[PDB]
Design a protein around this ligand. Structure first.
Ligand code: IHP
Lengths: 167, 154, 709, 730, 178
């Protein structure tokens, strides 16, 4: 949700499988700004770490496995050999074409320069967040600050009430 | 609390630190609720030296088996309680256990301190290194080689 | 031929057959003659139990001869092998008792498993693809435990070297998982097969083939470590060590957790502790589950069966009101409304029932245990009277709720089926509903052990008799909404996957059509027809232990009863109108089946139309005439070319066309001037004339084992 | 009741309400109901008790349901007395016979107590002991967590709660929970830094941080003594410095550290000494451990006894190995049954022990083959080769700690060296030395695999130290030398990922020093591809292009050469944007995809699809895609199909129609539903635009694909369309 | 319909206010939730879906939906042997959805949701994010730190069969946090 600038995780979107504990989201979409075609996802919280979830996870569960898992995923996707940036480019190309069809518009293709620039800007924003989270110099990670911002009541109280910042 | 009557009622290689002895004595007294001489107060409450070994090993400098804990208790603490282990523990003021960790830290610090011809094979292949072929030409050569191999097979 | 009849009467004469098979001079000759006779009698193995056991033992004698005199007896057995395997697999799908065909396959495999018999290994290899596919489909199905054990054993003990198994290895993985989850002998066999695969195959290839099973396989292996048998657990630990790092690789399909979805407490008994001056509730759900498990199992001691029956009976007594008073009960049931007022035309359907409450599930289990106690011989003298009287009680509760002076609002006139008819968490009924008795009867009818069907028929008879007494007539009794629930709940057994559940549904339908009045049967004839046809369709290609045959007989009997013309004295307006409406709907359903891709359903529809013509005295054309609109797209095929359709659909359309056109006055007369008719005729000509290679290149034929059908 | 309908009715109908067969029916039913009114609670209680005797699951469930209820009906004084008596009851020795029961009666008793309201307090150390002893692991962990949250996570009670919780986390191999707890608990910032480092595999930095913490603690000990509250932190430092040294392959130093006078650690020596062939220290440590060993370690003691029985220079006893392996397996299985039924990280040590134990048995077989009687015999050689191949293919996984890889590989190394020594000393049979060369090759391959695993886990210096041991071997086959140089090059590439120019220069130096003349054409091509990668990172673009060209000319099937050349050309194309570079990059990428290993090629086809965004009005890049895509199996395109359809709607769909058509021919169901959905979406949009209409070109392309699929797969597509037609009723 | 049109007349005063509209929406949502609970909770495929009821492995080798979303490493594709006769009606994703059970040639029962979407573009975007998650998963399988933490994205199979309709792979044990 944070690194890929996806739309906010409403509690109706979060599907919990009682038989296994596996979670899936129905459904994430890229948070493309319809007016400008770039990603925002600049919400008051970086992800849903709301008080009922925080209580169920417990402070040990938030500090240890949640944070360590986020750090590990960030460090894994930042490995150059995986070439995640290329996959992101080829997916966001379809996303940008769809945004152009929805907003700006053998139908003529959109401008190659505009498409390339928008896709590069979006992938750069994604990879910037990814590389910020992956950085682990000194034994400290931005992920701890990100988790603290998500749990913080100051950030929670500024969210949409329909998001349920109490649940 | 008085237990109800039943039908069956008849009508060491490393030296022991004072902290280990104190944990042993306190485990026997607090957890088993047994007296000094391990006389059974309630029949259901038999001594459990595995639990005592578990308690001692939480702070011990080396693994103490349950048999070793029983032997130590019966052969040292019983005669000592009959200076008491509490008095020795209070007087030691954690000095001995601190010096144990200082010694381990010194041993760990000691251990930490103790820590051309290439053109010939291309020319045999037939590759002019200084005049690169673009990928289109190499792909064409690959295709020609594959076609010739197919013709030879046929 | 005479000697086998004499052995059948006197089993000591096997000694002469054994002597012939054991002598080198006569072994091959006598084995040839005996296998040819037994192969001629192979279909009888699935029909007559005594002859089936006899023929199985004689086949075992032959296979032991092939063990004794390998050189000539392998040559003797070799040509017969294909017939044995293929006919055993084919005949078991329709046999009433198919168990002996699989015991024959097991004996054949244990014979060829002597290993030296290379001439039989070579002869057996072409059978291997179809055999393994059939066995995999069988073991994947729902069967009794001994049948599934046999299917798994047959899958794991196919008498071929592992190198020949290589292309078919994916078929063996699900039986392997089943074996690891089976009995001790099955677990040992599965561990042996798995160790063979690990030792002989490359780890990457084996891992790739395990990968579909791998979540279930690794969990089975982990559980096997906890097996009390030291040999089994040690073999499992060795196999896990041989897997190396593959044993602990992340399962994408994680381990399932037991989650409680219901907040409400289950039913409980009240225990008073006078010393504490307080009462506690003692919870019964687990107790009822344990009692039902004890009564289901054959291994249970009679003492504990009696204890389980006592628990179930006491729970059933505790969960009913007991406040009924004799004079009040007679005053209520003797009210004239029970015999004069029109019974409300209200339908009860489990389509509107929510998920069972813990109370309702425990009631259903307790009632099932009561019925099982009624059939167990040691508990029958006390359980059977209790079961009959409890059925009367529940039927009386249902009758008083459903009609008379004080019928509940959900039964009152103009009320639709709703959740209020059942005990549920949210809206529900006030107290346990009496319909839970019907759920227990359906469970008993659908139970694996078919003897339980008899007590279900007894229960239905008791319900019908009590309703007839209270309401004054059988016709009034069958108008109860309870009987609509009975129809829907018992017919649902036919949709259930297992053959025994289906068979229970068929038996319930036969009983109901035999007992209840003709008007009620005519009203429900289309539901019974759909259930029976679904039984015939769904077991196509599966092992049905006479379920399809019973369905066919039941369908023919139903059609005969309903179609049989009423006598001049019986020709009331209501019964005649009901019969005409039911006949219209049933003939409509049958004519639509005439082109069905399902060969069994198609042939049964054609036979049913002929049976209706014979019973009514009308002709098949006259019966089919008002419906034939439903055939207009099919006779001849308009909307698709046959080349586009699958082969089974093509055969169904061609047979339906043959049937409609061959009628004495033709229902449809083909006219070659009509474009679709000329197209169909040209396709038929091309199919008859074209070469087999020209047909094979067409995609729809490309996979047929034979073009000949 | 039957008559309950009367009570539900309103007063008016009740006031208004106020034959032989029916009368007989109601009389018989009244007699039945009178028989039921006699039924008493005692009968149910007795039968219930009997069923609890027969069923252990029922008994456990009933006690867990019943004891809290009994506890609720006790008085407060009685409750306090019973709790004070329950505390020593749980501690009693008599329960120890239950230890291997499944369930233990004490397990059920503790589960019943946990439900009681008001709660029954239990000491944290007792909870930890019960959790590890009676299979109460997660119940005890949750109880301790609740106790810690009640106390606000310090006082000695809070200290012992967090101590017991930390020990339970460590015993459960729940590294992250333990790390979080200790990050909150710890007093030294160095401890939190070290835990963070070790938690994510930075074992070298964690070791340095632990050393810094120890230096700070020693500096503070000269000022004042240490409270017993800080001793768990010092124990953590010692234990995890030992663990980091294990992961950093520092086994000699650990054996020295464990033999230090006055502070001997026989268990550490027993774990470490065999890896460095210090079998005398192994024997001494085995004796000390055997006098006094934890019960969970019993299987490892039997396994190490087998190690000594096989490999000790003087006390070789091969007859003991079968019984020692059986005992190790039995003890490991016993330990397994004491673990939770849901398999998690706590089960991993025993799952590794399984492979270790079978490899001990296989090693015994190999050494039986090397005896003078059996040496040179055909069956011995066949068994030896079989076991060597089985070891070669049977590997641990990447999630395993490097210590476990060390165990497996160093044991195998001892037996490979045994093979080499046996067939070099005798040299009567095998005059061609093929058996010794088999041992040498196996040892070299095992060393390279260990170094590769070290590199994959980020221990690049450890990997470089491991790979340097190949030079110790006098002669090695050229394949192993090639693999060693390749792993060294990959190590330098990984180092340059964070250091930059200098490590690229070191890798280039390694490549330049390589004496190609022994290496094959494929090896030379791989070397030149690596050289091109290094020169590309050095920004020596021309020399990198030379290297990639020569590499692909050497072995024109080498997928990695094509992929790296494509990456280099795509990087130049994105900046400079001359279309011919785009075409070259697409050609390279497509030639890398010309194989069935779809998982490797997936990242290349993404680049190909992204590059089509740079196409001109003449569709040059799409022309290149159409030309070169032949030879790329359609399985490669399955994941891309949404993107392929997006390109199909665009102007480039004219040249991509053949590609999508081939994918649809081979995988009809994969293409049909997306093409159908796209076609109907286009029709809907066209209807909105002209609110019959001539179909657009994308619609024509979709219709062509669907028509071709209907021609090749008519029964499948008619079944798919039949399914979709039915969905309308849903 | 008549009284609904009466309540939602925007010409009456005070109706254009957003929160009054919200209250009216809540009222009518409660009314329809009361009315929806009275509907049947399952239907049988025979009632309307003769082709699905008749379908068997003899009809075609059709793979269960979603088998081609990511190419399985081997050709062990699960083929469709049956459509189970009962389709259930379940409240998921704040919509009424039909749960179809497909029995596979392996004998396992696969639940699928038949879903109706009024918005085409949003559904395509959701499938795009699901595809991205599927593409990222193999990277997590290959590193220590992620494999040892058992980290993997859960991406249910979603197959769009039409602009308005798609087949989703259901977990019947799944609840949403709301
Ligand atoms: O660890 P890396 O250097 O990133 O490369 C490894 C592995 O390399 P090693 O076997 O030398 O450790 C293989 O790379 P190649 O040998 O093919 O050069 C390859 O596995 P395969 O043996 O199956 O080809 C795989 O790369 P891929 O994901 O493309 O299969 C993988 O690289 P990853 O770490 O990215 O998985």
């Amino acid at each position: 949700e944070f690194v890929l600038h996806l739309n906010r995780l409403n509690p109706e979107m979060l599907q919990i499988a009682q038989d296994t504990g596996k979670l899936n989201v129905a459904y994430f979409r890229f948070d493309i700004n319809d007016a400008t075609g770039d990603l925002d996802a600049n919400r008051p919280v970086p992800f849903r770490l709301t008080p009922n979830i925080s209580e169920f996870l417990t402070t040990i569960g938030v500090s240890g496995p949640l944070t360590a898992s986020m750090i590990a995923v960030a460090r894994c996707f930042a490995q150059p050999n995986f070439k995640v940036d290329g996959i992101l480019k080829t997916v966001l190309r379809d996303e940008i074409i769809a945004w152009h069809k929805k907003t700006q518009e053998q139908p003529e293709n959109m401008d190659s320069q505009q498409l390339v620039s928008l896709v590069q800007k979006a992938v750069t924003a994604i990879m910037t967040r990814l590389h910020n989270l992956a950085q682990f110099e000194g034994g400290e990670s931005k992920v701890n600050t990100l988790v603290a911002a998500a749990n913080s009541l100051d950030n929670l109280c500024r969210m949409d009430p329909a998001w349920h910042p109490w649940l | 609390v008085v237990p109800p009557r039943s039908l069956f009622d008849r009508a060491d290689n490393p030296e022991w630190l004072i902290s280990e002895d104190w944990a042993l004595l306190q485990a026997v007294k607090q957890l088993l609720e047994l007296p000094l001489n391990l006389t059974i107060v309630s029949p259901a409450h038999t001594p459990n030296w595995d639990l005592v070994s578990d308690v001692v090993n939480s702070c011990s400098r080396i693994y103490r088996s349950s048999k070793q804990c029983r032997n130590r208790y019966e052969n040292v603490i019983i005669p000592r309680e009959e200076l008491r282990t509490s008095q020795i523990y209070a007087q030691d003021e954690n000095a001995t256990h601190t010096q144990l960790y200082t010694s381990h830290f010194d041993l760990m610090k000691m251990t930490a301190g103790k820590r051309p011809k290439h053109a010939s094979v291309l020319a045999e292949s037939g590759i002019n290194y200084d005049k690169p072929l673009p990928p289109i030409q190499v792909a064409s050569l690959r295709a020609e080689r594959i076609a010739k191999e197919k013709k030879a097979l046929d | 031929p005479y000697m086998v009849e004499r052995i059948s009467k006197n089993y000591a004469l096997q000694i002469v057959a054994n002597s012939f098979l054991a002598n080198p001079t006569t072994s091959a000759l006598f084995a040839t003659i005996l296998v040819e006779y037994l192969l001629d009698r192979l279909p009888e193995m699935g029909s007559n139990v005594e002859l089936s056991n006899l023929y199985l033992k004689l086949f075992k004698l032959v296979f032991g001869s092939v063990s004794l005199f390998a050189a000539e007896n392998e040559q003797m057995l070799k040509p017969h092998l294909h017939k044995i395997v293929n006919s055993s697999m084919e005949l078991a799908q329709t046999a009433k008792e198919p168990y002996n065909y699989f015991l024959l396959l097991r004996a054949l495999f244990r014979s060829i498993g002597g290993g030296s018999h290379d001439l039989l290994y070579q002869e057996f290899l072409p059978l291997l693809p179809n055999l393994l596919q059939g066995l995999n489909m069988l073991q994947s199905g729902l069967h009794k435990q001994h049948m599934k054990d046999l299917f798994v054993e047959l899958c794991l003990t196919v008498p071929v070297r592992l190198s020949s198994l290589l292309p078919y290895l994916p078929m063996l993985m699900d039986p392997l998982v089943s074996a690891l989850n089976g009995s001790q002998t099955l677990v040992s066999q599965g561990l042996r097969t798995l160790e063979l695969c690990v030792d002989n195959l490359q780890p990457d290839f084996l891992y790739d083939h395990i990968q579909p099973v791998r979540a279930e396989l690794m969990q089975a292996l982990w559980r096997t470590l906890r097996n009390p048998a030291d040999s089994i657990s040690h073999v499992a630990y060795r196999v896990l060590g041989k897997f190396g790092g593959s044993n602990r690789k992340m399962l994408k399909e994680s381990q399932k957790l037991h989650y409680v979805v219901t907040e409400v407490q289950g039913p409980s008994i009240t225990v008073e502790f006078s010393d504490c001056k307080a009462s506690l509730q003692l919870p019964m759900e687990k107790a009822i589950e344990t009692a039902l498990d004890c009564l289901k199992s054959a291994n249970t001691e009679p003492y504990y069966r009696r204890q389980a029956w006592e628990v179930i009976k006491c729970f059933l007594v505790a969960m009913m009101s007991l406040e009924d008073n004799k004079h009040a009960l007679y005053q209520l049931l003797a009210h004239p409304n029970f015999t004069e007022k029109t019974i409300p035309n209200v339908i009860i359907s489990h389509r509107y029932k929510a998920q069972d409450t813990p109370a309702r599930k425990t009631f259903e289990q307790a009632l099932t245990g009561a019925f099982m106690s009624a059939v167990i011989k040691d508990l029958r003298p006390s359980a059977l009277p209790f079961v009959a009287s409890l059925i009367r009680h529940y039927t009386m509760v249902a009758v008083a709720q459903q009609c008379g002076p004080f019928l509940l609002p959900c039964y009152q006139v103009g009320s639709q089926p709703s959740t209020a008819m059942f005990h549920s968490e949210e809206n529900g009924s006030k107290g346990m509903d009496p319909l839970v008795l019907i759920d227990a009867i359906a469970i008993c009818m659908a139970y694996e052990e078919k003897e339980l069907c008899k007590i279900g028929e007894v229960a239905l008879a008791v319900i019908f008799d009590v309703a007839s007494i209270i309401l004054g007539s059988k016709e009034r009794a069958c108008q109860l909404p309870l009987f609509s629930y009975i129809v829907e709940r018992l017919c649902a057994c036919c949709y259930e996957q297992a053959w025994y559940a289906k068979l229970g549904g068929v038996v319930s339908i036969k009983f109901l059509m035999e007992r209840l009045p003709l008007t009620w049967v005519l009203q429900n004839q289309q539901t019974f027809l759909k259930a029976l046809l679904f039984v015939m369709m769904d077991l196509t290609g599966e092992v049905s232990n006479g379920a399809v045959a019973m369905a066919k007989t039941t369908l023919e009997q139903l059609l005969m009863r309903c179609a049989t013309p009423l006598k001049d004295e019986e020709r009331a307006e209501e019964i005649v109108a009901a019969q005409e409406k039911s006949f219209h709907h049933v003939t409509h359903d049958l004519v639509r089946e005439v082109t069905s891709p399902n060969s069994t359903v198609r042939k049964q529809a054609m036979h049913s139309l002929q049976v209706l013509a014979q019973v009514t005295g009308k002709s098949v054309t006259v019966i089919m005439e008002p419906h034939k609109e439903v055939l207009q797209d099919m006779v001849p095929p308009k909307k698709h070319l046959l080349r586009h359709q699958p082969a089974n659909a093509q055969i169904g359309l061609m047979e339906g066309n043959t049937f409609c056109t061959t009628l004495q006055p033709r229902l449809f007369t083909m006219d070659l001037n009509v474009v679709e008719h000329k197209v169909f005729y040209t396709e038929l000509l091309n199919l008859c004339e074209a070469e087999d290679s020209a047909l094979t290149k067409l995609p729809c034929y490309k996979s047929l084992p034979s073009l000949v059908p | 009741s039957i008559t309950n309908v009367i009570n539900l009715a309103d007063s008016h109908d009740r006031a208004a309400f106020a034959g032989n067969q029916l009368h007989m029916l109601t009389n018989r039913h009244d007699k039945f109901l009178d028989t039921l009114r006699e039924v008493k609670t005692g009968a149910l209680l007795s039968a219930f008790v009997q069923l609890c005797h027969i069923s252990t699951t029922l008994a456990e469930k009933t006690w867990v349901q019943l004891f809290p209820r009994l506890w609720k009906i006790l008085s407060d004084r009685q409750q306090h007395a019973l709790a004070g008596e329950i505390s020593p009851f749980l501690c009693s020795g008599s329960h120890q016979v239950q230890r291997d029961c499944q369930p233990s009666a004490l397990n059920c008793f503790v589960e019943a107590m946990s439900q009681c309201v008001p709660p029954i307090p239990i000491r944290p150390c007792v909870l930890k002991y019960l959790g590890k002893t009676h299979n109460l692991w997660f119940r005890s962990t949750l109880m301790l967590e609740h106790q810690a949250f009640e106390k606000g996570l310090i006082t000695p009670p809070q200290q012992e709660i967090l101590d017991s919780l930390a020990e339970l986390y460590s015993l459960l191999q729940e590294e992250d929970m333990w790390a979080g707890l200790w990050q909150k608990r710890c007093k030294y910032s160095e401890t939190a830094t070290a835990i963070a480092y070790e938690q994510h595999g930075f074992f070298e930095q964690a070791q340095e941080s632990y050393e810094k913490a120890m230096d700070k603690a020693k500096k503070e000990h000269e000022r004042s003594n240490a409270s017993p509250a800080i001793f768990p932190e010092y124990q953590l430092w010692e234990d995890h410095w030992i663990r980091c040294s294990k992961e950093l392959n520092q086994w000699e130093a650990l054996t020295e550290y464990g033999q230090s006078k006055g502070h001997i650690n026989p268990y550490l020596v027993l774990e470490c000494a065999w890896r460095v062939s210090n079998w005398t220290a192994m024997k001494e440590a085995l004796v000390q451990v055997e006098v006094s060993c934890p019960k969970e370690m019993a299987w490892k003691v039997n396994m190490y006894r087998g190690y000594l029985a096989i490999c000790h220079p003087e006390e070789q006893q091969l007859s003991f190995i079968e019984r020692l392996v059986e005992m190790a397996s039995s003890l490991a299985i016993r330990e397994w049954r004491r673990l939770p039924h849901v398999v998690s990280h706590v089960h991993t040590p025993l799952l590794q022990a399984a492979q270790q134990i079978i490899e001990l048995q296989e090693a015994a077989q190999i050494n039986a083959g090397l005896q003078p009687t059996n040496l040179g015999r055909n069956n011995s050689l066949h068994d030896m080769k079989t076991v060597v191949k089985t070891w070669r293919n049977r590997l641990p996984i990447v999630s395993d700690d490097l210590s476990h890889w060390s165990s497996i590989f160093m044991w195998r190394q001892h037996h490979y060296q045994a093979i080499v020594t046996a067939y070099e000393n005798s040299s009567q049979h095998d005059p061609s030395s093929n058996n010794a060369m088999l041992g040498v090759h196996a040892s070299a391959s095992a060393i390279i695999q260990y170094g590769k695993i070290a590199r994959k886990q980020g221990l690049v210096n450890v990997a470089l130290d491991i790979l340097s041991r190949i030079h110790t071997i006098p002669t090695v086959p050229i394949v192993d030398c090639f693999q060693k140089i390749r792993q060294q090059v990959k190590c330098y590439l990984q180092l340059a990922g964070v250091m930059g120019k200098n490590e690229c220069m070191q890798g280039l130096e390694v490549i330049e020093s390589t004496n190609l003349k022994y290496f094959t054409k494929e090896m030379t091509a791989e070397f030149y591809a690596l050289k091109g990668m290094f020169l590309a990172q050095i920004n020596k673009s021309e020399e990198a292009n030379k290297a990639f060209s020569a590499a692909v000319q050497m072995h024109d099937v080498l997928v990695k050469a094509w992929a790296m050349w494509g990456d280099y050309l795509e990087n130049i194309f994105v900046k400079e944007r001359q279309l011919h570079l785009g075409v070259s990059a697409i050609t390279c990428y497509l030639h890398a995809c010309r194989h069935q290993n779809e998982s490797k090629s997936r990242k290349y086809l993404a680049k190909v699809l992204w590059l089509l965004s740079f196409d001109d009005d003449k569709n040059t890049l799409a022309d290149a895609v159409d030309k070169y895509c032949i030879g790329v199996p359609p399985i490669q395109w399955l994941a891309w199909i949404p993107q392929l359809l997006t390109c199909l709607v665009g102007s480039e769909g004219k040249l991509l129609l053949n590609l999508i058509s081939q994918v649809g021919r081979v995988y009809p169901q994969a293409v049909y539903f997306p093409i159908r959905t796209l076609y109907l979406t286009l029709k809907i949009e066209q209807r909105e635009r002209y609110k019959p209409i001539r179909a657009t070109a994308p619609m024509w392309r979709c219709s062509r694909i669907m028509h071709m699929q209907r021609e090749l797969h008519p029964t499948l597509l008619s079944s798919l369309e039949g399914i979709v037609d039915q969905m309308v009723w849903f | 319909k008549g009284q609904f049109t009466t309540d939602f007349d925007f010409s009456v005063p005070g109706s254009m206010k957003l929160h009054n509209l919200i209250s009216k929406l809540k009222k009518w949502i409660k009314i329809l939730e009361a009315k929806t609970k009275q509907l049947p909770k399952f239907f049988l495929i025979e009632e309307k879906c003769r082709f699905l009821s008749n379908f068997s492995a003899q009809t075609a080798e059709v793979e269960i939906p979603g088998e081609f979303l990511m190419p399985k490493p081997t050709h062990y594709y699960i083929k469709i042997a049956r459509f189970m006769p009962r389709v259930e009606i379940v409240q998921k994703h704040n919509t009424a959805a039909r749960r179809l059970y497909i029995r596979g040639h392996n004998g396992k029962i696969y639940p699928y949701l038949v879903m109706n979407d009024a918005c085409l573009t949003e559904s395509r975007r959701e499938e795009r994010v699901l595809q991205l998650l599927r593409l990222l998963n193999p990277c997590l399988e290959k590193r220590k730190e992620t494999t040892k933490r058992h980290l993997f994205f859960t991406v249910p199979r979603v197959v769009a069969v039409s602009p308005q309709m798609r087949l989703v792979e259901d977990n019947p044990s799944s609840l949403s946090l709301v």
